[PDB]
Design an enzyme around this catalytic site. Structure first.
Site, mmCIF file in Angstrom:
data_model
loop_
_atom_site.group_PDB
_atom_site.id
_atom_site.type_symbol
_atom_site.label_atom_id
_atom_site.label_comp_id
_atom_site.label_asym_id
_atom_site.label_seq_id
_atom_site.Cartn_x
_atom_site.Cartn_y
_atom_site.Cartn_z
ATOM 1 N N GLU A 186 101.337 23.211 84.541
ATOM 2 C CA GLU A 186 100.981 22.016 85.037
ATOM 3 C C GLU A 186 99.738 21.118 84.034
ATOM 4 O O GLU A 186 98.761 20.801 84.525
ATOM 5 C CB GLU A 186 100.415 21.719 86.667
ATOM 6 N N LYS A 296 94.434 22.799 105.503
ATOM 7 C CA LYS A 296 93.224 22.468 105.299
ATOM 8 C C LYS A 296 92.932 22.975 103.616
ATOM 9 O O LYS A 296 93.171 23.927 102.978
ATOM 10 C CB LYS A 296 92.386 23.522 106.126
HETATM 11 O O1 LIG Z 1 100.986 11.481 88.144
HETATM 12 N N1 LIG Z 1 100.663 12.763 87.952
HETATM 13 O O2 LIG Z 1 100.977 13.338 86.742
HETATM 14 C C1 LIG Z 1 100.403 13.488 89.011
HETATM 15 C C2 LIG Z 1 100.088 13.194 90.057
HETATM 16 C C3 LIG Z 1 99.835 13.690 91.233
HETATM 17 C C4 LIG Z 1 99.544 15.254 91.160
HETATM 18 O O3 LIG Z 1 99.086 15.782 92.339
HETATM 19 C C5 LIG Z 1 98.607 16.929 92.245
HETATM 20 O O4 LIG Z 1 99.441 18.189 92.350
HETATM 21 C C6 LIG Z 1 98.648 19.470 92.622
HETATM 22 C C7 LIG Z 1 99.698 20.520 92.530
HETATM 23 O O5 LIG Z 1 100.392 20.431 93.742
HETATM 24 C C8 LIG Z 1 97.638 19.517 93.536
HETATM 25 O O6 LIG Z 1 96.687 20.645 93.448
HETATM 26 C C9 LIG Z 1 96.646 18.249 93.311
HETATM 27 O O7 LIG Z 1 95.691 18.456 94.312
HETATM 28 C C10 LIG Z 1 97.330 16.938 93.274
HETATM 29 O O8 LIG Z 1 96.616 15.892 93.272
HETATM 30 C C11 LIG Z 1 99.913 15.808 89.958
HETATM 31 C C12 LIG Z 1 100.034 14.840 88.939
HETATM 32 O O1 LIG Z 2 99.270 22.125 95.275
HETATM 33 C C1 LIG Z 2 100.177 23.111 95.871
HETATM 34 C C2 LIG Z 2 100.731 23.788 94.511
HETATM 35 O O2 LIG Z 2 101.181 23.003 93.720
HETATM 36 C C3 LIG Z 2 101.297 23.718 92.456
HETATM 37 F F1 LIG Z 2 102.307 24.426 92.606
HETATM 38 C C4 LIG Z 2 100.279 24.342 91.799
HETATM 39 O O3 LIG Z 2 100.503 24.913 90.647
HETATM 40 C C5 LIG Z 2 99.604 25.385 92.851
HETATM 41 O O4 LIG Z 2 98.532 26.125 92.104
HETATM 42 C C6 LIG Z 2 99.315 24.701 93.947
HETATM 43 O O5 LIG Z 2 99.008 25.665 94.892
#
Ligand SMILES: O=[N+]([O-])c1ccc(O[C@@H]2O[C@H](CO)[C@@H](O)[C@H](O)[C@H]2O)cc1
Ligand SMILES: OC[C@H]1O[C@H](F)[C@H](O)[C@@H](O)[C@@H]1O
Length: 394
Positions: A186, A296
Site C-alpha cells: 500500500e 475499535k
Molecule cells: O485514495 N486512496 O488512495 C485511499 C483512500 C482511502 C484509504 O483508506 C485507508 O485504508 C487503509 C487500509 O485499510 C486503512 O488502514 C486506513 O485507515 C484508511 O484510511 C486508502 C487509500
Molecule cells: O485497514 C484494514 C487492513 O487494510 C489493509 F489490508 C492494510 O494493509 C492492513 O494492514 C489493514 O489492517
C-alpha cells in the site's frame, strides 16, 4: 510452486503478527489508557516500542510473536481448505534506521512460519508492509501520519531491505513455499511521486531477478485505477512473473459506508469484472467482511468510526456498539455479511484469487477469518454458496 494461470489463491493474511495494529490487538494498547482518555495511547508500533523502551517492548513482543500464530494455525488454515498465506513484515525486522525504537526478532518467527507453511502444503507471499519514513501514513506501516518513504535515503534503505529479503527468501531454499515477494504494501499513490514509485518497483524487480531468483514479484496497485499497471513490468519488456495485488474495502469513506447491501454487492462484482480485463496476473491480497468501520481503532488509536459519525467530520449512519460482538448481530447483518463475503469470493476467484484480512483478531469479527467461519458467515468449505451467482460472471 504455483501456477498463476491455473490455480486460484485461497488465503488469509497473518496480520497483526509482525506489525502491530491497534484494532487487531487492542489489548497491547489499552493498558496505556487513562480511564476513557485515549490521548496517551501509542498510535503505532513505532511509538509503542518507543514508549515501552527496548527491554519491555522485546519482552511483550516475544510473548506476542510466539503465541499469536503457531503451527496449529497453519494446520487449521489447511483444514479449512485454504492454500495460501500472505505474511506482513516491517522493514525494521531486517534493518533499523539510526534512532529507531523498533525491536527485532521477527525473522526467527517468519522462518518458523515458512517451515510450517511447507509442512502444511501452504504457499506464501512475503509482504514488506512497512517502509522507513512510511509509505502511507497508516498505523499499519508502523508509523502513522507521516509519509517520507520517498524522502532522504528512505527509498534506498527500503531497497536494501528488499535485497536482504530477496537473498534469504527469493532463492532455492524456499522455492517450494514462497510464491511471491511483495515489494511494498500500500504505497499511498495520491501523495507520492508515481514516477519515483515505478522506478522503485522496477529497481526491486531488477534486483530480485539479478539474484537469480524466479520468484514472482508482487506489486501493490498503489490505489491506482484498475488497469493502471497494465503497461508496467510487461512481458513485452522481458519482465515476467509479475502479479498485481489489489486491495478492496467498502468502509473507508462515508460514501462507501452509505451503500445498501445490494450496491455493496454490485461494487464487489465489478471489482471482478474489472480485474478480469487486466493484463497481469492479479490477486485480491486484502479484503474483509466489513460493511462498517466500527471495529475499535480501525481508523487508528483515538479515532472513532465514520459509521456512527464519529470520525473525520463524517455523519451518523448507524450505531457501532451493537455491531462490535457477532453474537449480538441482527439477522439482517448476518445475511448481509454472508452475501458480501460470497460476492467477493466469486469476484476474486474470477482471476487470481483472494487473501482475506485477516486470519484472526482479538475481538474484531468483521476482520477475522476464524470468527466469521465459526459463526457460519464465511462459507466452509469456501466454495459453499447460500447466495449463488450474485455477479453472473461469464
Ligand atoms: O485514495 N486512496 O488512495 C485511499 C483512500 C482511502 C484509504 O483508506 C485507508 O485504508 C487503509 C487500509 O485499510 C486503512 O488502514 C486506513 O485507515 C484508511 O484510511 C486508502 C487509500
Ligand atoms: O485497514 C484494514 C487492513 O487494510 C489493509 F489490508 C492494510 O494493509 C492492513 O494492514 C489493514 O489492517
Amino acid at each position: 510452486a504455483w501456477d498463476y494461470d491455473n490455480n486460484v489463491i485461497r488465503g488469509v493474511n497473518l496480520g497483526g503478527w509482525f506489525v502491530l495494529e491497534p484494532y487487531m490487538t487492542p489489548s497491547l494498547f489499552e493498558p496505556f489508557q487513562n480511564g476513557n482518555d485515549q490521548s496517551g495511547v501509542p498510535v503505532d508500533e513505532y511509538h509503542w516500542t518507543q514508549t515501552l523502551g527496548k527491554e519491555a517492548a522485546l519482552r511483550i513482543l516475544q510473548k506476542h510473536w510466539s503465541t499469536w500464530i503457531t503451527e496449529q494455525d497453519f494446520k487449521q488454515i489447511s483444514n479449512l481448505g485454504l492454500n495460501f498465506v500472505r505474511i506482513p513484515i516491517g522493514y525494521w525486522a531486517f534493518q533499523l534506521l539510526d534512532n529507531d525504537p523498533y525491536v527485532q526478532g521477527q525473522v526467527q518467527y517468519l522462518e518458523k512460519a515458512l517451515g510450517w507453511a511447507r509442512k502444511n502444503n501452504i504457499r506464501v507471499w512475503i509482504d514488506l508492509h512497512g517502509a522507513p519514513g512510511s509509505q502511507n501514513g497508516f498505523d499499519n506501516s508502523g508509523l502513522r501520519d507521516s509519509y517520507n518513504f520517498q524522502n532522504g535515503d528512505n527509498t534506498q534503505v527500503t531497497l536494501n531491505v528488499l535485497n536482504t529479503i530477496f537473498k534469504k527468501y527469493g532463492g532455492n531454499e524456499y522455492s517450494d513455499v514462497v510464491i511471491g515477494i511483495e515489494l511494498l504494501n500500500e504505497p499511498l499513490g495520491p501523495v507520492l511521486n508515481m514516477d519515483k514509485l515505478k522506478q522503485f518497483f522496477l529497481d526491486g524487480y531488477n534486483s530480485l531477478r539479478q539474484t537469480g531468483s524466479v520468484t514472482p514479484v508482487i506489486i501493490h496497485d498503489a490505489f491506482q485505477v484498475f488497469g493502471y499497471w497494465n503497461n508496467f513490468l510487461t512481458v513485452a519488456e522481458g519482465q515476467w512473473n509479475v502479479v498485481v495485488d489489489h486491495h478492496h474495502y467498502q468502509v473507508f469513506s462515508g460514501g462507501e459506508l452509505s451503500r445498501n447491501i445490494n450496491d455493496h454487492i454490485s461494487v464487489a462484482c465489478n471489482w471482478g469484472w474489472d480485474a478480469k480485463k487486466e493484463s497481469h496476473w492479479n490477486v485480491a491480497g486484502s479484503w474483509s467482511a466489513a460493511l462498517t468501520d466500527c471495529a475499535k481503532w480501525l481508523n487508528g488509536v483515538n479515532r472513532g468510526a465514520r459509521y456512527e459519525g464519529a470520525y473525520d467530520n463524517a455523519p451518523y449512519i448507524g450505531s457501532c456498539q451493537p455491531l462490535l460482538d457477532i453474537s449480538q448481530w441482527s439477522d439482517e447483518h448476518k445475511t448481509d455479511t454472508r452475501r458480501y463475503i460470497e460476492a467477493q469470493l466469486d469476484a476474486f476467484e474470477y482471476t487470481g484469487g483472494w487473501v482475506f484480512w485477516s486470519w484472526k483478531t482479538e475481538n474484531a469479527p468483521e476482520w477475522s477469518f476464524q470468527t466469521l467461519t465459526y459463526n457460519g458467515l464465511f462459507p466452509q468449505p469456501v466454495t459453499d454458496r447460500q447466495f449463488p451467482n450474485q455477479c453472473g460472471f461469464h
